[PDB]
Amino acid sequence: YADSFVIRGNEVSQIAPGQTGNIADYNYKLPDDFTGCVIAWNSNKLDSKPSGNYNYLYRLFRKSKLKPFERDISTEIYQAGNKPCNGVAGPNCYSPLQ
Amino acid sequence: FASVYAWNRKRISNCVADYSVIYNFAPFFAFKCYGVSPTKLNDLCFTNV
């Protein structure tokens, strides 16, 4: 089972199992046994763009945790704090998308 | 807050506390939790924190 994604060199060490990180949080969970492997290489000459690749997104502030090998792709309405935000209130939205 | 040369140690006791007020802060980076799993810091009574 092969998967692909693009992350910074900072988060590369987070793909190790049994640890908490920016990637290993609600955003992405991986099996801790991890019979497979991980292959990565630098691609700053292709993915990077002089105009600024702001089209790459990641959901950090997802409400609930994640189970290994689970897809997290949805609208992801942000409802936190001691009040119903309803997605329209405005403040405390801090949307997970970045 | 103070630098690493002089920490501010506090004794929390006699109160009842939960884990929501700690979750008031979003930019959590060093969320490493030892001894106790973060998802179950509730419903268990310490002796002095």
Side-chain angles (χ1 to χ4, degrees), chain B residues 13-35:
Chain B
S13 157
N14 182 280
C15 64
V16 74
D18 77 319
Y19 196 59
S20 64
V21 77
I22 307 159
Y23 257 51
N24 197 6
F25 292 45
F28 272 31
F29 162 59
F31 193 50
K32 169 251 286 183
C33 211
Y34 277 159

Side-chain angles (χ1 to χ4, degrees), chain A:
Chain A
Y1 274 140
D3 307 271
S4 178
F5 50 91
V6 161
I7 48 172
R8 283 171 180 176
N10 171 330
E11 305 140 356
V12 167
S13 81
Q14 294 187 23
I15 320 292
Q19 65 91 35
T20 304
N22 189 11
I23 293 332
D25 79 333
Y26 325 110
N27 200 342
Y28 170 56
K29 202 61 74 185
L30 58 101
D32 291 313
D33 38 42
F34 202 99
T35 306
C37 56
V38 160
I39 302 297
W41 71 84
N42 200 5
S43 59
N44 75 328
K45 293 179 179 179
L46 273 174
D47 216 345
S48 173
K49 202 141 69 174
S51 296
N53 275 309
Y54 303 146
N55 308 114
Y56 278 69
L57 201 138
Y58 83 104
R59 266 92 163 179
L60 206 163
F61 290 154
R62 215 265 313 277
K63 192 65 174 174
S64 202
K65 218 74 172 71
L66 203 59
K67 191 204 149 18
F69 275 9
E70 255 188 352
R71 305 296 306 223
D72 179 41
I73 293 98
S74 70
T75 78
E76 292 212 17
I77 49 171
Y78 200 98
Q79 296 306 289
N82 217 64
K83 293 179 179 179
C85 299
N86 307 119
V88 287
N92 301 300
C93 56
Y94 322 127
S95 192
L97 45 59
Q98 270 104 32

